[PDB]
Design a protein around this ligand. Structure first.
Ligand SMILES: Nc1nc2c(ncn2[C@H]2C[C@H](O)[C@@H](COP(=O)(O)OP(=O)(O)OP(=O)(O)O)O2)c(=O)[nH]1
Ligand SMILES: [Mn+2]
Ligand SMILES: [Mn+2]
Length: 425
DNA sequence: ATTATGACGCT
């Protein structure tokens, strides 16, 4: 009862740019705006692989990881923007720079953890306390939440539903209690409306967000009402929400561990997890996963919002699938050099912007017919930002994989260089 | 022949 802590101490938001690469291209090219459009990498093989899809295009069934020539069968008016190609490979620089614009705006409101190029987590606990003191008991007006959904409401036209649910939530609110978790979430949501307004003002990019008490629920909330909307998932809404939530929808359960939860326990939905003791879950899935699942099915998660706005590694990768697999020494060298040249560019810019140097170079390759995604991963020292040296060292470090007697065998289907182990410079 | 990344856990 009174001692069962409920994981309601924090206010955490997950902000996610809607179809981010598409929006970046649509800011740059107005002819793409408010159209079915997608972003592709390469164009020769089946029109190129799609990596981002506007919501208008998604309404036709266009999805990520789909060939453009197939998407065009579903959506013949689909517009396509192409990823920049440099030194023979995809170059994602435009989107990393757009991402940094967005991150820098979010950082003005709270500390953020960059979770990927287009999404960050936000720790709003301090910001909400400050704002709750600034209101001095003043109640929260629906006008402050023009794009917010309250999950699970209303109970007992899309925008009409949204406003009814918001009204129920606000009427149920105890504004005099500066320590009510639900009030904290509500104020967090007001701040997130402001953050999203600033992001759109200052970049033109729209985003969705989730507001809850931890990262997993913030992330799950964010996806309930997309695009250009934010969803508040309260502690009290967890039992109903989870009672029909497929386990795979929860961050980190979408793969093998989630599948084994489903198969071993004989369940489908997140809420069924509550029926097992912590020890049972630890027995099936290990001590960490067990504790995490026992708390998470009750809506409780303690993973902190790490104050990290910048990537921890800087990486360059290219697949060589099918018959393009690299089969000679000259080929492997030239592509290691192209990779090392892009990496050198990104690293020098990183050192100038962010006052840090990487110290370790990781070289990963795949060989043809290998089942694994990394056939080999080996590290060496990274002592100067010079593409020729980095490529020479990556070769030095992988060359004993060649089993030929000038040739390369098994041919390589992936090269990958990653600078890691940053130190302040 | 979804591809390009990037975080993080296990050992
Ligand atoms: N190169 C590459 N980029 C990817 C891949 N998956 C996603 N991206 C890029 C394009 C996406 O716009 C961006 C962020 O991914 P998300 O899962 O958040 O989807 P996106 O923002 O496109 O749409 P959303 O509104 O979040 O449903 O990262 C991939 O497999 N390869
Ligand atoms: Mn997104
Ligand atoms: Mn995302």
């Amino acid at each position: 009862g009174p001692h069962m802590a409920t994981g309601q101490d924090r206010v955490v938001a997950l902000v996610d740019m809607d179809c981010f690469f598409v929006q970046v291209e649509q800011r740059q090219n107005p002819h793409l705006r408010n159209k079915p459009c997608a972003v592709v990498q390469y164009k020769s093989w089946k029109g190129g692989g799609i990596i981002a899809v506007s919501y208008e295009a998604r309404a036709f069934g266009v999805t990520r990881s789909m060939w453009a020539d197939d998407a065009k069968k579903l959506c013949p008016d689909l517009l396509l923007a192409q990823v920049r190609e440099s030194r023979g490979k995809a170059n994602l620089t435009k989107y990393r720079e757009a991402s940094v614009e967005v991150m820098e705006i979010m950082s003005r409101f709270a500390v953020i953890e960059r979770a990927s190029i287009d999404e960050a987590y936000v720790d709003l606990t301090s910001a909400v306390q400050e704002r709750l003191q600034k209101l001095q008991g003043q109640p929260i007006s629906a006008d402050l939440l023009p794009s917010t959904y309250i999950e699970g409401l209303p109970q007992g036209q899309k925008e009409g539903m949204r406003k009814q649910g918001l009204f129920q939530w606000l009427d149920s609110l105890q504004i005099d209690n500066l320590t009510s978790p639900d009030l904290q979430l509500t104020v967090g949501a007001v701040i997130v409306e402001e953050m999203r307004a600033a992001i759109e003002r200052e970049t033109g990019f729209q985003c969705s967000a989730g507001i809850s008490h931890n990262k997993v629920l913030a992330k799950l909330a964010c996806g309930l009402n997309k695009p250009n909307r934010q969803t508040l998932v309260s502690h009290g809404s967890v039992p109903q929400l989870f009672s029909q939530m497929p386990i795979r929808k929860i961050r980190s359960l979408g793969g093998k561990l989630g599948a084994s939860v489903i198969e071993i326990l004989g369940i489908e939905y997140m809420g069924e997890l509550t029926q097992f003791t912590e020890s049972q879950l630890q027995s099936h899935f290990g001590e960490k996963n067990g504790s995490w699942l026992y708390a998470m099915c009750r809506g409780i998660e303690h993973d902190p919002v790490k104050p990290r706005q910048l990537p921890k590694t800087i990486g360059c990768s290219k697949n060589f699938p099918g018959k393009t697999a690299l089969a000679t020494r000259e080929q492997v060298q030239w592509w290691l050099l192209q990779l090392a040249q892009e990496l050198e560019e990104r690293l020098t810019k990183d050192r100038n912007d962010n006052d840090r140097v990487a110290t370790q170079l990781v070289v990963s390759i795949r060989v043809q017919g290998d089942k694994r995604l990394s056939s080999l991963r080996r590290c060496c020292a990274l002592t100067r930002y010079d593409a020729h040296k980095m490529s020479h060292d990556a070769f030095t470090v992988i060359k004993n994989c060649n089993t030929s007697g000038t040739e390369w065998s098994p041919p390589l289907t992936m090269l990958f260089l990653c600078a890691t182990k940053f130190s302040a410079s």
